[PDB]
Design a protein around this ligand. Structure first.
Ligand SMILES: C#CCN(C)Cc1nc([C@]2(O)CN[C@@H](c3nc(-c4ccccc4)no3)C2)cs1
Ligand SMILES: C#CCN(C)Cc1nc([C@]2(O)CN[C@@H](c3nc(-c4ccccc4)no3)C2)cs1
Length: 330
């Protein structure tokens, strides 16, 4: 089997991407944030505290003939920005882009933190990291991909995110029309539950390439590119007036600037992030200070190849017995 679904930025900054997902019978379509950095599929629901729902579409398990309470199961998760959610669990039929999993754990939120309430366009998350990170207790649950994997034509999914434009998640096949040149595959470590890999270095703008190993994760659920402070300083030093602002919480730059590209290494191949992809626009409406799309990982403890990086590439998440990641230019 295969599936293919379009993913769409939630706002003019590409802060996140949402993908329609069918849950239950008859289908209830919710727009979920596909997150290769976590492993829970959770939704706003008829159980979510009413004061914490503000415009989201909710899943109502009592209206699904295929929903079953996963008795005694609870979940509770935090994300890297400090956002969080928790609740109980149903199993139900879940379809993405024509690919169906029966008996998928659908984690129903009883509580969500303020950032989720505020994101009226995000109806929940669909985790695509390894199932070892799933938070359901006492019986850990599998991700949608892990459940689908054995049925797929090939045990893979691909992320083809757009820059201020829609893109595609495919399951089970590699669309050879979606990228240029070749896909370079690189080894993955699952030791922390992530799609964790080692970039071979970087370049800033037209500069020469610096060969250096950068361990990090491929995370569609993170907006920005978080890299070591050394690398990030070398990038922003090329932008007149750019500086790290403690009040804003990262590097800002004059909105009058034109940003250099940033290249990262995948084996002997290179992915070039255009400078425009690094511009997140005014820090507040009307400001002439713009927020940078490359930020330090120093306070996080892990480097994160988030959407800024991934949207410059066609990315293969190969979930074969020995997992790998593939990157191609596009
Ligand atoms: C701090 C620290 C160390 N580590 C926990 C950092 C990491 N953090 C992650 C993710 O929590 C998983 N992916 C990302 C994600 N955030 C969201 C999201 C958050 C709020 C609103 C909407 C979406 N969705 O996905 C970040 C992996 S490693
Ligand atoms: C312009 C503009 C809007 N604003 C002033 C700047 C922006 N801010 C963002 C965030 O993506 C939103 N959440 C923040 C955050 N995320 C994490 C984090 C992510 C993953 C793992 C660990 C930590 N830490 O802080 C930055 C986009 S534009």
């Amino acid at each position: 089997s295969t599936g293919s679904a379009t993913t769409t930025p939630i706002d003019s900054l590409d802060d996140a991407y949402i993908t329609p997902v069918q849950i239950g019978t008859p289908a209830q379509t919710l727009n979920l944030d596909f997150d290769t950095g976590s492993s829970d599929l959770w939704v706003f629901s008829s159980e979510t505290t009413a004061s914490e729902v503000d415009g989201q579409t909710i899943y109502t398990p009592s209206k699904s003939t295929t929903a079953k309470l996963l008795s005694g199961a609870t979940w509770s998760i935090s994300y890297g920005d400090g956002s969080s959610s928790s609740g109980d669990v149903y199993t139900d039929t879940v379809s993405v882009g024509g690919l169906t999993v029966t008996g998928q754990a659908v984690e129903s939120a009883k509580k969500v933190s303020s950032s989720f309430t505020e994101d009226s366009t995000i109806d929940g998350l669909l985790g695509l990291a390894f199932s070892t990170l799933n938070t359901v207790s006492p019986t850990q649950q599998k991700t949608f991909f892990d459940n689908a994997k054995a049925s797929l034509d090939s045990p893979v999914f691909t992320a083809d995110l757009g820059y201020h434009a829609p893109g595609t998640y495919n399951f089970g096949f590699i669309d050879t029309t979606a990228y240029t040149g070749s896909i370079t595959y690189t080894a993955v470590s699952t030791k922390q539950g992530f799609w964790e890999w080692t970039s071979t270095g970087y370049a800033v703008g037209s500069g020469t390439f610096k060969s250096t190993s950068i361990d990090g994760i491929a995370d569609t659920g993170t907006t920005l590119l978080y890299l070591p402070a050394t690398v990030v300083s070398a990038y922003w030093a090329q932008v007149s007036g750019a500086k790290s602002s403690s009040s804003v919480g990262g590097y800002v730059f004059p909105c009058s600037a034109t940003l250099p590209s940033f290249t990262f290494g995948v084996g002997s191949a290179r992915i070039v992030i255009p400078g425009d992809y690094i511009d997140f626009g005014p820090i507040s409406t009307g400001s002439s200070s713009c927020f940078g799309g490359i930020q330090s990982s120093a306070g996080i403890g892990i480097n994160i190849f988030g959407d800024v990086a991934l949207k410059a590439a066609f990315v293969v998440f190969n979930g074969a017995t020995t997992p790998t990641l593939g990157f191609a230019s596009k």
